[PDB]
Swiss-Prot record, chains A, B, C:
Entry membrane topology: Multi-pass membrane protein
Outcome (variant: Q66E): In strain: B/r; AA sequence
Transmembrane annotation, as ranges: 1-6, 8-23, 39-51, 54-66, 83-91, 94-100, 135-141, 150-159, 172-182, 184-195, 211-222, 224-235, 253-265, 268-281, 292-303, 306-315, 331-340
Function: Forms pores that allow passive diffusion of small molecules across the outer membrane.
Organism listed in the record: Escherichia coli (strain K12)
Protein name as it appears in the record: Outer membrane porin F
NCBIfam families xrefs: PRK10002.1
Induction or repression: By growth in low osmolarity conditions (low sugar or salt); activated at low osmolarity by OmpR, repressed at high osmolarity by OmpR (at protein level). Levels of OmpF protein decrease in a lon/ycgE double disruption (at protein level).
Record topological domains on the Extracellular side: 24-38, 67-82, 101-134, 160-171, 196-210, 236-252, 282-291, 316-330
Summary of subunit composition and partner proteins: Homotrimer. Forms mixed heterotrimers with OmpC and with PhoE; other mixed heterotrimers are also probable. (Microbial infection) Trimeric complexes with colicin E3, BtuB and OmpF can be cross-linked and immunoprecipitated.
UniProt entry keywords in alphabetical sequence: Cell outer membrane, Ion transport, Membrane, Porin, Protein transport, Signal, Transmembrane, Transmembrane beta strand, Transport
GO cellular component labels: cell outer membrane; membrane; monoatomic ion channel complex; pore complex
Gene Ontology biological process terms, A to Z: monoatomic ion transmembrane transport; protein homotrimerization; protein transport
Length: 340, 340, 340
């Protein structure tokens, strides 16, 4: 909500309290999403100041507070800053921002990251360019310097983040996206490549000095209908774990497909149908194996802009004999959301 | 404070900065409350949106930031989300919310949880139904569907929270409260029962498959006078530790009494007198032993709605030979509170 | 930004999102500031309520959220409450506040703590009176009870904070500051002395039962010019580490000098030149050694009150053979700041 707007500066202080519960069978160790309380809250601010008629400065910060921990020792589990960046936007020359932000390959993966609760499975955090990452310098142009309405592009510089863990690290890299929107249609293409750290190369799964990710996207977004498809491939970038062996690393290559179809009724209801499949190829010792593979059916009911409820159901197609130990059980999520 | 109210949505962003210091003798390892700096801050939001004339949606989130840690390694000690829930309220049919919220037995224990600093000793966090807990689904009715003014009830469903620690866990359970208010008087009754996890049953103190808690409450709240009494009993629910042995678990049964008498002067001062006693019975190897036992004398001075100061003094009656090692020294707390 | 002002209470909710990157050579283990992403965000509130015409109550809380951690296990690294206090201000009698606040010796060290990114090197956190500390009771008088315009003083009581670490602990102590301001000129003097804990005395570096810190300050602050000098000395208070040996403790004595010269152009640019040097003396086994020693050159460009960018460059004069292992490489910091 906009809580301040004076002298050229506007601040939006936003957040949500999500009462959320996952229903699966087991111990929930063989299901898609897990089981039990998943309640969380979000808090963030978004600021924008008009320096002059052509120049805008902006900043954004967003945090995740889990609401399913006790008030004991595990109290901070899962808490974290999601976004933290500041930038400048100038006329039709473009915008530049630096900090913790979305990788450029999410410019394409955002097309299908619209399910009520699940979906967006290949947009991993701290995984080069597909999700939220630290230390990215992003340059974005809209409408090709004001000359081609609807044609955008971006280039992103990713600085090395040598962390304690192979999973959360990355070396330097460069990525870019180009997209075109016209009358409800949109097409995007996005590609990133980066070096891998020593710690990443010491991992038993995956071999290579460079990580690459690319995705394509196609959508139709108008007349209360939302249809979108993504196709992407990664080399040495998708994090995987062999549960049997307890060995971890990156998939040599993945081939990813995500499809979503939703419809927004005027009275508030928004059904959703999706299909997601991600398969790893050439995994040392396993060969080809599915990482993700389901059908989704769900609905969101929007009481208004501040309140909603949803049910999200994953009809998991992972087989029980999946070679990496990837869970095969279904998951149903039910949620009540207040937001401002 | 209400910082936003537009288009049917109102957001209250609230908080406090509490400069707080406990005074006790020792090393403060044999006193009631401890000793030294206890400064903390609170931040929270409360939202409510009017969907239509009969239907309200709401959400609340509240966090505790300790202000007595260094900026080093111990910086997060004691920080945590206290509340995180969202719900819907419909006409006279009732309200339903889900998330981290107060257990239904706090519907009765809240009567005497009014001391300036201490008190509310049996309303433990993450302890089934007596305090703040995760994964509770709460249904509350006011005025018996609009037919009986002042008669309320609630039913609460508690989902299993299988945590790392016996102390912070719980199995499934159901609890309820009924209360009646009339012209300054109020009477409540509240009861909850839940399964205990394996980890809870593996503990050396306490034996049983089910945890039960109930409390009764009586109050008089009018004419600047506040008088309240609680009587409650628990089976297998109150967490205890034998400091000598360093063995921990739950008290087979407890018998709890809490009394409070306060008076609010018009000029700002609010003296308080209270008495609290909680005794465990049938503790393996100890027999009957006091957990809590004191007299309280205190005062709060309210400069206005935003500022106050208080002194809270605990005249501890625990004996020095208490068998579980429960501290016997007095504690004095002094506090300066700014809130919004 | 002031987001609430009604019925005598005003709340300022403030913050910033700082996209920040340090450039140094190495592994950055021999540079002044380190290397890589240093993005962070700040969130805080400042409240003030007018109780009556002579009496004001106030509270402040401020937190640091790092933006250069992954969303994994290291997510909280560096997060912490910086300030948390509440107080009362009465007419010309003075103000009193208690909580986590700046030590009184920062009353003098604040003179030169004005660099764009670095500087303020001897104002360590959780180090008795020179920086932010927990459990301080501060009394401050302005204009000598309203009788001497520009003459101020403060007295501060520091309570023992017996922490897990020698570095973040302190015993009881008392400190004070006196300062005088007149037509752009300001002179301050500040001194604090405290007991040291057992854990502090068990450390291999430094010998003594009491920690002392004092600093003097002189500034000229008017006509867009800012010039300031600090001179200070510490006994048993400055934390040091011998990287070779991996032994840690406090410097027996330090002699500290800090100089800053800045100029504010009307168009937004504010160049800065500074010099800082801190030398430890009588360090067990080393003799005299430099802790800090550089020249700074930098600039901040202020687009307006909400947006700025800066470059801060440290021309390090530490030699490569420095006996404690103190880094000798330069550091360049570049920052884009949105604030509200």
């Amino acid at each position: 909500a906009e809580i301040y707007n004076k002298d050229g500066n506007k601040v939006d202080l936003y957040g949500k309290a999500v009462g959320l519960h996952y229903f699966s069978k087991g111990n929930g160790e063989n299901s898609y999403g897990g089981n039990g309380d998943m309640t969380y809250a979000r808090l963030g601010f978004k600021g924008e100041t008009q320096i002059n008629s052509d120049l805008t400065g902006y900043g954004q910060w967003e945090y995740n507070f889990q609401g399913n921990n006790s008030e004991g020792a595990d109290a901070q589990t899962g808490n974290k800053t999601r976004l933290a960046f500041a930038g400048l936007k100038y006329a039709d020359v473009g915008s530049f921002d630096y900090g913790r932000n979305y990788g450029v390959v999410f410019d394409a993966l955002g097309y299908t990251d619209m399910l009520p609760e699940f979906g967006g499975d290949t947009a991993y955090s701290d995984d080069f360019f597909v999700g939220r990452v630290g230390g990215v310098a992003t340059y974005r142009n809209s409408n090709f310097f004001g000359l081609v309405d609807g044609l955008n592009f971006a280039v992103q510089y990713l600085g090395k983040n040598e962390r304690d863990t192979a999973r959360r690290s990355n070396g330097d890299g460069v990525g870019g996206s180009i997209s075109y929107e016209y009358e409800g249609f949109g097409i995007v293409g996005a590609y990133g490549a980066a070096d891998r750290t020593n710690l990443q190369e010491a991992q038993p799964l995956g071999n290579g000095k460079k990580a690459e990710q690319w995705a394509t996207g196609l959508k139709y977004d108008a007349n209360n209908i939302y249809l979108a498809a993504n196709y992407g491939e990664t080399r040495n970038a998708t994090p995987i774990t062999n549960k049997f062996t307890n060995t971890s690393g990156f998939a040599n290559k993945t081939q990813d497909v995500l499809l979503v179809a939703q419809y927004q009724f005027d009275f508030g209801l928004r059904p959703s149908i999706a299909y997601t499949k991600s398969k790893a190829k050439d995994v040392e010792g396993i060969g080809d194996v599915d990482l993700v593979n389901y059908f989704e059916v769900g609905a969101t009911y929007y009481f208004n802009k501040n309140m909603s409820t949803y049910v999200d159901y994953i009809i998991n197609q992972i087989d029980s004999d999946n070679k990496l130990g990837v869970g095969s059980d279904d998951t149903v999520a039910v949620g009540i959301v207040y937001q401002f």
